[PDB]
Amino acid sequence: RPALYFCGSIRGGREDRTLYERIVSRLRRFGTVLTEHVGGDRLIHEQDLEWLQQADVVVAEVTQPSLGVGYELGRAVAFNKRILCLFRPQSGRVLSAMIRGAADGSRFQVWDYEEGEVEALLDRYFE
């Protein structure tokens, strides 16, 4: 059972907070989830990085633009983590080229999806 780290916008905005709760709930079926979503900012940075380094898979919902989500993904790539990013084209946004373009299709995957189907998608990824 993998250790899972979940990334999603907070100070970038909480528009997708309910969807993040669904994602985290489904991820908890497959492994232990660490996430901020359940001094000062230095402590948050250190704690989030600690949990990210411990994870077997980093899962990020990348629809809402966020510096912190991007930063976590950049650190995760440099740590050579297995990464799953989830993006909703129905938002009308174009996903950052730095995230879409970082994908290699194996270790770093980016999946476009419709909101209602996120649980099934996670089921498929996590077998």
Ligand X SMILES: O=P(O)(O)OC[C@H]1C[NH2+]C[C@@H]1O
49 is a contact residue toward ligand X (CB under 6 A): no
The reply to whether 67 sits near ligand X by the rule CB under 6 A is yes
Q: Of these partners, its own copies, ligand X, none, which one is at the site of residue 62 (CB under 5 to 8 Å by kind)?
A: its own copies
Question: Any contact of residue 23 with ligand X (CB under 6 A)?
Answer: no
Check the annotation: does 68 bind a ligand. Answer: yes
115 touches ligand X by CB under 6 A: no
Query: Where in the chain does DSSP place strands (E)?
Result: 3-7, 32-34, 57-61, 82-87, 108-112
Residue 35, CA distances (Å) to 20, 90, 98 in order: 10, 25, 23
Question: Is 9 annotated as belonging to a binding site?
Answer: no
Which entry of its own copies, ligand X, none binds 40, CB below 5 to 8 A by partner kind?
Answer: its own copies
Binding mask 57-96 for its own copies (x = CB under 8 A): -----x--xxxxxxxxxxxxxxx-------------xxxx
Residue 59 · residue 7 · CB < 8 Å? yes
Q: Does 42 bind ligand X (CB under 6 A)?
A: no
- Burial class from Cβ neighbours inside 10 Å (0-12, 13-18, 19+) for residue 39 reads exposed
- What is the distance between the alpha carbons of residues 101 and 62, in angstroms, rounded to a whole number? 13
CB distance 70 to 102 below 8 Å: no
Binding residues for 5-hydroxymethyl-dUMP: 8, 10-12, 66, 68, 72, 96
